[PDB]
Each structure stands twice: as structure tokens, then as C-alpha cells.
Design a protein around this ligand. Sequence first.
Ligand SMILES: [Mg+2]
Ligand SMILES: [Mg+2]
Ligand SMILES: [Mg+2]
Ligand SMILES: [Mg+2]
Ligand SMILES: [Mg+2]
Ligand SMILES: [Mg+2]
Ligand SMILES: [Mg+2]
Ligand SMILES: [Mg+2]
Ligand SMILES: [Mg+2]
Ligand SMILES: [Mg+2]
Ligand SMILES: [Mg+2]
Ligand SMILES: [Mg+2]
Ligand SMILES: [Zn+2]
Ligand SMILES: [Zn+2]
Lengths: 162, 266, 38, 42, 38, 71, 177, 99
Amino acid sequence: FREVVEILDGKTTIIEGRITETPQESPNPPNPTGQCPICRWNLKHKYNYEDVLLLSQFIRPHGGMLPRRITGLCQEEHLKIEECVKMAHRAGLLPNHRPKLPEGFVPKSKPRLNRYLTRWSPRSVKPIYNKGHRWNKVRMPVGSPLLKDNVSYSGRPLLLYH
Amino acid sequence: EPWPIHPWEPGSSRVGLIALKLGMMPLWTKDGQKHVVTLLQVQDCHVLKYTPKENHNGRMAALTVGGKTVSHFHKSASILEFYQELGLPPKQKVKIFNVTENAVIKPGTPLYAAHFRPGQYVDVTAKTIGKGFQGVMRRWGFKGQPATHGQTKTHRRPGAISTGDVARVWPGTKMPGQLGNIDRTAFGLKVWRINTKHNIIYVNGSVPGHKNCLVKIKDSKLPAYKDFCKNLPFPTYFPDGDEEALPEDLYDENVCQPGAPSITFT
Amino acid sequence: GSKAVTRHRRVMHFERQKLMAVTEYIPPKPTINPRCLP
Amino acid sequence: RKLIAEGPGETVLVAEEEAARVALRKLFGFTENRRPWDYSKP
Amino acid sequence: FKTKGVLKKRCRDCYLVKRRGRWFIYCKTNPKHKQRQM
Amino acid sequence: TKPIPRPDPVHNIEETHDLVLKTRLEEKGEHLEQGPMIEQLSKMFFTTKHRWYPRGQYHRRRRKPNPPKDR
Amino acid sequence: SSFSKAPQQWATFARVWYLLDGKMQPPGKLAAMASVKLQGLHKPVYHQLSDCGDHVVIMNTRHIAFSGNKWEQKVYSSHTGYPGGFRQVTAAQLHQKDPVAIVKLAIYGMLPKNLHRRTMMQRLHLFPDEDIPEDILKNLVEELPQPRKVPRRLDEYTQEEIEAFPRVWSPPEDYRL
Amino acid sequence: VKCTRARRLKKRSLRTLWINRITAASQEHGLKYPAFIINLIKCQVELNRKVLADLAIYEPKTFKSLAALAKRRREEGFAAALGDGKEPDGIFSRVVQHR
RNA sequence: CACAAACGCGUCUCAGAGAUAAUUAAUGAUUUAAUCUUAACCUAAUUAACUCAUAAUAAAUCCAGCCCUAGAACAGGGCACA
Ligand SMILES: [Mg+2]
Ligand SMILES: [Mg+2]
Ligand SMILES: [Mg+2]
Ligand SMILES: [Mg+2]
Ligand SMILES: [Mg+2]
Ligand SMILES: [Mg+2]
Ligand SMILES: [Mg+2]
Ligand SMILES: [Mg+2]
Ligand SMILES: [Mg+2]
Ligand SMILES: [Mg+2]
Ligand SMILES: [Mg+2]
Ligand SMILES: [Mg+2]
Ligand SMILES: [Zn+2]
Ligand SMILES: [Zn+2]
């Protein structure tokens, strides 16, 4: 990991890069022949928004996403993991991955409403006043459609709109 | 045995009175304008009981105030027992005032019309003149039908009351009924003159309710005069606390007093 | 009674809708995704 | 510290009385789970 | 802003951004190119 | 299991006159109106106020005087 | 087993008080079991004509959780009867105004549409937080399990489990976070 | 006419009541009604819903034994399905012919 | 205006907080640039509605008769000053 350090000493700005030690991959993956990290660790169709230990491996400390060219995931898993990270952040997981704002934490607001499996943004969805009748009903989407391929032990399909 | 007096606070509220509406009088201002004042006489104002804030509302305490004296021979057993325990004769009208916990007064305390000083805004609550079961034209002000252009038995009918497709009338439909005998409140009534000897308050504008009726007077709750109680006596007016007799009539800075030099413009 | 060819998509009978749903195309799905495969 | 009987009740005293009645019935053998009376020809 | 069903860039400086659940073609050089997907 | 709670307290006992003390715990009575009584009963039994109201002659006459009983 | 008729009847048709935690729980799944317990559908002696009904006390109502964007999309519409008196309140606004109302309406909808719905609703107790009067606390018999398992946060995971969980990918040293 | 219609519907109503009571008594043992019924049938125990409801109401020990048998049969079936082995057979999954 | 009242043509009063839709900019990744974000963290300028402070009622079992600015009847307020 690289860190940028700025030093101010008498109208002089010193910008330096510092390299720190970084953790490495575990020695024994279950499927070493797999090119993709998730696809070789056999976590494909296994992870979800609840699995925070996997989603937290590759994210910026401020909650930002990480580039695929650096991560190495396949496109579908990259999109699915991006959706899962967004869902976890909206649900309230990863509490330590928010920017530190000393000024903004004093003026408290309304308590955060508990939520999970949230698909859209909380500030962009207008309430459905019509709600539709039985034949034509405006169903409420829950969860991301990219996670419809996960393993279903019960075998019942995951209701993405309710 | 007075209760401790707390200092005035910006978020505090004061207790009101229960007066009697005498009548209406004119009053001229130093600028030549003429206003109409109503005389409210505080005959017998006494604090009857005190209810805790938690046991009444959870935000503000409640103080009970009684009106003018009535006869013992026409009141109920429980009311007579309550007044016997209190030590005071029964009152006619009994009202509840929402006051802050720092302005509480011991029950049995009398109150005087000097509680309001010349120049203040008060709210007046009373039962208006009850006109009984009146027609729709007098009640809601609906226009009537033409008088003589052939209209038959319709000069004051309300007319249509709903629509055809609805097949019913909405609950908010305006219809003839009882009119007048309801409690109404007038806000922002300015007080000009305070007569101490007779306990008379001169309130600007009309007062809801007929003459010789009980009127509940309180401070103005309007945001324009939310913090006008700073200069007023916070707990109440104590005639014994100052040990000084107030003048017979306290006037406002603009009221043309009866003894005047007959002001002329320049 | 409508004509054989119409503009309003000529909503089908329930049995025909069931037949269409049953006969919908099913693409062949391999066991292992070949993108990240060796 | 060995449970011999138990009884329900509306109040504690009534429940205790019912428990005592159940224990007495169990001791005397007159229980709902007892042997039915023998109606045969010896 | 012009409300349209289909958005297309009228110049090379127009950028498409997803905001408030809709798509917006924003242009700084030509403000008349502001398009909002309905 | 837990031990049986026992509550025995006689606060009406008077050292001057036990005869009056005994009647002090028995002279308790109260009467309320129909509305408040029904509300109190509903609050006690966690039911609605509609059940406690009486019934008319037509329904009270048609009740079976001797309903069948099993067991 | 060998009880008298009156105590046996009282034991058979005795009422039971249940407890239900509502923190981080879906209102629909809470209301399902609440309705089951209120109707008495958990008793083999249940019958529609019989008054078999159990009390349910639900706590931590303010901390309820909705799946998806239901907080922003779900609406509750009421009408005062007067013209122009039709109001539509969002789920978030209704919860802010009254925490109880959400689960109360959910249970009211899930309960059967007969006249016994009011009677069985009067037996229901809902509290926004873990502040229950002692007269109600002394009546609780058992606590029903939460229908939804509350997921852990990242900081709630133990360091031994964090280290046990393998690192899937190895970040390069040259990259900057 | 209503008497005839209700006489026809009485069988359905009482069957539904028995099913509801069985569901209550089975969920009291932590077992679902469809699984309980299919596993009791797989054990060649031909008891109708009326008898099952009577046992649930008046024979709690017998109903718990039946629920335990059904759960054991369900576990044996799941184990057999997971194993996919012809030789491994459960103790309670054995089929007995008529005699 | 030939009743002590009613009435207008005559007189008095009329309000604070939150919240938003469209639309602005701050910080920031996917897409180490930028980018108001169906990415989060707090953001700030913000329509009308809509709720809430606040305001009104809010002391149970005396009611024969006589008055009332209270009233269709039923109800309600008074009958000690004099
Ligand atoms: Mg009148
Ligand atoms: Mg006219
Ligand atoms: Mg004519
Ligand atoms: Mg005429
Ligand atoms: Mg004619
Ligand atoms: Mg109609
Ligand atoms: Mg044809
Ligand atoms: Mg048949
Ligand atoms: Mg940047
Ligand atoms: Mg810019
Ligand atoms: Mg309010
Ligand atoms: Mg009276
Ligand atoms: Zn891959
Ligand atoms: Zn452009």
C-alpha cells in the first residue's frame, strides 16, 4: 500500500510516497487452476450482502470501490460485488469505512432507519401512491437481480420484486 | 406560606385570569385615532388546585383558576366538599391554564387585574352569543335565491347539497344547525388601561361572548409576542410584595388620558 | 369477435399462453463458466 | 426433591389443593390411567 | 432542460450522468443541450 | 422451580377497637356508571366494550334452558 | 393427567403471554407469528367459536427494519371522511410520527377480517423500546425466536474469525488506497 | 337448501379444522405439516387427520412419538438422497409388503 | 331600529418548527482525472401541500319551582349580598 505524506515547514511543501507492508493471499486455494480470484476460491454463487469479510477485502477505506484491472475479478462477479457493497453500505454494514468528519458528527439528525437488501438509493425513489390493482401491480423491488444465480438450498426462487 | 418564586426564563409561560365582561367604551389615542375597548372586571380570581406536569400533559403544568362567587345552595356535594377543603366559596366558571413548572403558584392564592400591565397582548376565550338553531344563510353566509322572480318556497333554502354520482352527502357539508353557543378565542387583543381599584382591564377590540359573562384571559401565544413577559411580574402581581399602592389607573404611552391638555397638532 | 390479424397484439387464449410459456426457449447452460476457466 | 404430583389452578392456594388431590389419588391408585373394571365371567 | 424519451449528445462536451434516478445530458459550453430522460 | 410467594398483610387492624377494625376491611364498596363500569371490565379482561352490554328479550327468550352436557 | 374438571378446563384453556423482540426484524415476519399467536393457531385445541387467544408483547418497535426501499416507497393512505381529507403518509414518515403504527397496521392487516379481530387486537401490546411496565413483565411466559437472523457488522466480527477467513486476492504494493 | 349445502361443506370444514390442529401440534414440536404427513405416510402408518387431531388433543406423548418418527423418517430420506447409495438403507425406510 | 335585543353599511383578530418535487454547488470510486451519488458519510439554497408545537373543551351522581344575553322539546347558566 502506498501513502502520500505532505509536510509543511516554512513555506515549503514536501510531498513524499511511503510504501507499507500489505497482506498476501492464503497459500492454499481450493481451486488453484482458476484464473479469477473468486472463481478459484469457489466463492462464486456463494457470497451475499451478509458476507462482510469477503466484501471488505477490496474496498477503499472511505467506502469507495476498487478498479477491476487491479482486483482481477471477472466482469459479472465485479458487478455483483459492487452491488453487494452498495447494499451493505446502505444497510449500515462496514461502519468503519466512512470518512471521518469531526464537524459533521456533532449535529445529529433523525435516527438511521434499519434496512437491508436495498436496491435503489434512499434519496432517489418516489413513493408509489397508486400501488396498482391485482392484475397490474407496481411491485416493490428488493435485492439485486445480479444475485439471482446464487445457490438455493431450499430450491425456491428468490423474490426480487415484493 | 408562599411557594418559592423562580426567576423568569425565556421559555416560561404565565398564568391567566377569569374576568367578567362589563361593556364597551371608546378610547382616543394621542395620534387622533379612536379605538374601542372592552371592560373585563376581575371580581374573584383564585387558584383552586395544582396539577403536576407529568400528571397533566408531560410538558407543562396545569393551574386551575376559579371565577366569581356563587351560592352554596345550588352546587353539588362533591364541588361543595372540594371548596370546603380549599377554604373558599364556590366559583361559577372553573378553567385550566397551561403554565410552565417555574411559574407555579400555591392553590388558594388570589389574583388581581394588575397581573396585566398597560401595553400587552392577551388572548380571550369565552362562549360566544348563542343564536340557537339558525338557518344556513345566517350560519354559513350562503346567498339566497331571488326574492320575486318566480321562486317558490326557496328564498332561504340551501339549495343543492351534494352531487348525483356520489349518491351521498359529505360529512363536511355546511347545513343549518346550532350556531353561537361554542367556545371561541380571540388572539392578539392589546390592553391599554388598567384600573386597579375596581380591577378593570381595557382590552382592545371585540370580546367574544355576551356582556356580564365569564371570560378566560391569558397572555398572547402568537410568535410576535412570545417573550413579552420579561418585564411583567413573573409569578403574579402581589399587592403585598411591593408595599406600595399602585395608581388608580395605569395608562399606556399612547392613551389620551381623561385629564389631558386637549392636544393640538403642530 | 375480432379479425385474425389485428393491431392490438390480439391477446391470446389462456391455454395458448400456457403453451407458449412451456415452449419458451431454454439456452444450454454449461456447468462451468468458460471465461475464467483455464 | 422428587416430584410426585402437580396441579393447576386459578390461584396459588387452589393449585396447591389440586396438587394435593392429585397426589392423594395417585397414592390411592384411583387415577384416570388405572385399570378399567373387569366385566367378565369367572 | 428539455424532457425527452431518448437522449443524444448534440456536441462533444455533453456528458451523460445518472442523477435522482434519471439520465441527464449536461453541457457546459451550450446550456441549451440540457436533456432529461423521462 | 421457584418458591411459592405468600402475601399476608392486614393494614386495617386497630389497637383501639378490633371489632371496628374487622369491619374496616369489609365495608369497602363502590358504584360506577354503565360506561365506566364496562370500560373497567374491558380493561381488566383485555376485551372490547361491546361484549358487556346486555341483550334484548328476543335473544334472551330463545336461549336453551337445559343445554345438553357431555362427559 | 388426573385433574378435576374445573382445573383441567382452566389449564387447557389458559391464556399465555409471549414476548417478541422487534429489533432488526421485518414487520411482515413479526406480524405472521403475532397473528398466529393471537388467533391461537398454535394450539391443538383451537376453534373459531372458542375464545382461545394468547397475548403477545412486542418490544424494540422503533428499531424495526424494512427489506429493500420499502421505507421510501411503501405508503399508508387514510381518509377522514371530509372532502379533501385523504392523506397518504410514507412509511418512514409514519414510523417517525408513531413507531407503533407500522407493526400495528401490519398485524391488523394479517389478522382475519371478522369481528374477533378487534377482540384479539385488544390483547396485543406494542412498545417502541425495552420499557415495559412490571405488571406486564410479570406475565411473560416465554420469548419467541426472532424470525430473521441479524447480520453482523464488520467491527462485530472477532479477530480470530477475521484471520481464519482467507484473503482471496493479493493487492499490489505499488497501488495507493 | 342451505342445510344441504352446509351438510356437504361440513366434511371440508372439519377436515380443515383437523388440519389446522395438526399444524399447531406439529409446529409445537418444530415440524412442518407437509413434511410430517409425507414422512408418516412413508412409514406405512395410515392415520387420517381426524385420528391425528384426536391424538394431538388427548395423547400428547403419542403425538410426540409420531412426530419423532416422522422426523427420523425425514432425516433418513435426506441422508439417502445425499448418499445416492443403493446399499445404505435406513432402519425406518424399509418397506413391508402385505401379509 | 316606537322591546332592554338583533343586524351591516359599522368595529376587532388572523400565527412558529420540520418536511419536501423540480433545480443548484462541496467531498468522493467504480472510471486513483473529472462526475450533486436507482455508491455511501454528513452536506448546504430550496414550491405548495402535510403533520407538530401552540390554542379550545377537559372539577361526575342537589336539582322541585322562578329568571337568563341559554334554548324547538330535551339540555345549560344563575336564585346570600341588593
Ligand atoms: Mg341564545
Ligand atoms: Mg339576497
Ligand atoms: Mg312558479
Ligand atoms: Mg315566495
Ligand atoms: Mg306552484
Ligand atoms: Mg355510494
Ligand atoms: Mg371470430
Ligand atoms: Mg360424499
Ligand atoms: Mg478524484
Ligand atoms: Mg465542477
Ligand atoms: Mg397538536
Ligand atoms: Mg344547571
Ligand atoms: Zn471470474
Ligand atoms: Zn453540448
